[PDB]
């Protein structure tokens, strides 16, 4: 354990300590002083005679007189036990499960590069969610990165772990079984408040719903540094689960706003040459590089279904942060204040919201071939009706014609009844039923973005 004192110069989260010939980038060592105190710091920018450590503590009860290094491990990165599954974690992951450490079946550097260009394959398989609207309008399939546009004081957060627990990986309806699909729920928060943090303990912990899941989550309280790496964990780990050992996976982020907020601090000092929003590009980089774990690799049906999860603040894609996302990611799923206010569960916008790829895994008796036009039935069927809704104080349900007056009423029944669902865990087929019914209020003299044939199957 290679000691080096020579701590000259202590500035903020940075630290020089002499030497730096012997060191390999992305390093970490414990500096221990007279108190022997542990502070932790990645060994960054290796100079030659010195290093630059970016420690995370407070440097008090610290003596320049006694300093050293117990060489911990430079390229430290996780082990892995995919069968350690009752695990619950904070940030990087020290047992918030409190259960005794893993068995490093393998040892995983958190970076390794994603997939192969020639590995990935365009979608072809739906996955149900336990939610209705978010399977109908925008339809979940495996290997889909669906961003879910949240906003400020909202219960996005809820509808996350909520629909989390509802979830069950499913393609039964297509003609396949469900026996050979392991379900890997991987859960990761960040920036958690006292309140929120227990809601977590409430869901998994509700019954054994950790019966298929792991937590990982770097509080605000927790250092923003360790924060950064937090995802990279389950990111990398997830590969080891499904790609290395098939599961049908669920990436569940948390406002990655935080990561980047967090990112910033590092650079703000490190003199990291800005970029737009002062924020140097590679945000660009990193962001690409994370969701490239989508696509179906050959020999693995155990492909990851991705959910990237953050909020815009002024709720426009103006922020790079959504933009970015919105350039590469396969969708968009927003939530309105109005909506929550109106008490719609899920409270998910219309036209604003969309699963970019979803033809592939649906139809064909997998959810009926008819799912297609049901999706564009209700879209336009609905959307028309909000025209009526919005012309009302001008001209009410009198000046109106019957049809459009029903299209006011359609809208009303649509929002209230279908898209609100509270906490009921509908079934994909049970979701479709509804559709029919609601549209049945309107005549087929007011239906056509489904063939009459099909509508008459469920009229």
């Amino acid at each position: 354990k290679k000691e080096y004192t020579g701590i000259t110069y202590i500035s903020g989260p940075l630290l020089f300590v002499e030497n730096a010939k012997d060191l390999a980038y992305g390093a970490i060592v414990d500096i221990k002083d007279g108190t022997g105190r542990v502070r932790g710091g990645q060994v960054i920018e290796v100079s030659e005679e010195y290093a630059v450590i970016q420690v995370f503590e407070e440097t008090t009860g610290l003596d320049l007189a006694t300093t050293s290094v117990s060489l911990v491990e430079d390229v430290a990165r996780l082990g892995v036990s995919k069968e350690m599954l009752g695990r619950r974690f904070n940030g990087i992951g020290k047992p918030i499960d409190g259960l005794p450490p893993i068995t490093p079946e393998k040892r995983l550097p958190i970076t390794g590069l994603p997939l192969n260009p020639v590995a990935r394959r365009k979608p072809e398989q739906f996955i149900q969610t336990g939610i209705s609207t978010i399977d109908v309008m925008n339809t979940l399939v495996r290997g889909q990165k669906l961003p879910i546009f949240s906003g400020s004081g909202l219960p996005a957060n809820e509808i996350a772990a909520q629909i989390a627990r509802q979830a069950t990986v499913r393609p039964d309806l297509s003609g396949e079984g469900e026996k050979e699909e392991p379900f890997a729920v991987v859960f990761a928060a960040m920036g958690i408040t006292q309140r929120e943090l227990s809601y977590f303990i409430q869901e998994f912990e509700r019954t054994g719903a950790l019966s298929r899941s792991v937590l990982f989550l770097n509080k605000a309280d927790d250092p923003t540094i360790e924060r950064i790496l937090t995802p990279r964990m389950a990111l990398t780990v997830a590969e080891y689960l499904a790609f290395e050992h098939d599961y049908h996976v669920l990436v569940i982020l948390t406002d990655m706003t935080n990561y980047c907020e967090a990112l910033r601090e590092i650079g703000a000092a490190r003199e990291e040459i800005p970029g737009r929003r002062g924020y140097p590009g590679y945000m660009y980089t990193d962001l690409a590089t994370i969701y490239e774990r989508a696509g179906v690799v050959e020999g693995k049906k155990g492909s990851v279904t991705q959910i990237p999860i953050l909020s815009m603040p002024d709720d426009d894609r103006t922020h790079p942060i959504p933009d970015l996302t919105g350039y590469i990611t396969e969708g968009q799923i927003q939530l309105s204040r109005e909506l929550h206010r109106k008490g719609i569960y899920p409270p998910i916008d219309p036209l604003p919201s969309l699963s970019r790829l979803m033809n592939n895994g649906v139809g064909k008796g997998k959810t009926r071939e008819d799912h297609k036009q049901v999706s564009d039935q209700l879209y336009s069927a609905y959307a028309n009706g909000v025209d009526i809704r919005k012309l009302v104080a001008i001209i009410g349900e009198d000046a109106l014609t019957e049809n459009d007056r029903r299209y006011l009423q359609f809208a009303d029944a649509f929002e209230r009844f279908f898209i609100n669902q509270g906490q009921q865990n509908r079934s994909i087929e049970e979701s479709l039923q509804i559709a029919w019914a609601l549209l049945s209020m309107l005549p087929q003299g007011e239906l056509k973005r489904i063939s009459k044939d099909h509508i008459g199957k469920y009229y």
Binding site: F16, S47, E49, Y50, E271, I273, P274
Partner: protein, 43 residues
């Protein structure tokens, strides 16, 4: 509409160019500090 368009338009850019200076001013400083002080691998 087009007027109120043009407003934003005006804003934006104006905000933006300021932002050069940020870096430019700060930058020059960096250069100083680093030029005098970045020679610790020499000694």
């Amino acid at each position: 509409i087009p007027g109120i368009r043009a407003q934003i338009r005006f804003i934006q850019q104006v905000l933006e160019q300021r932002e050069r200076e940020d870096t430019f001013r700060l930058k020059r400083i960096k250069g100083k500090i680093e030029a005098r002080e970045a020679e610790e691998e020499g000694g």
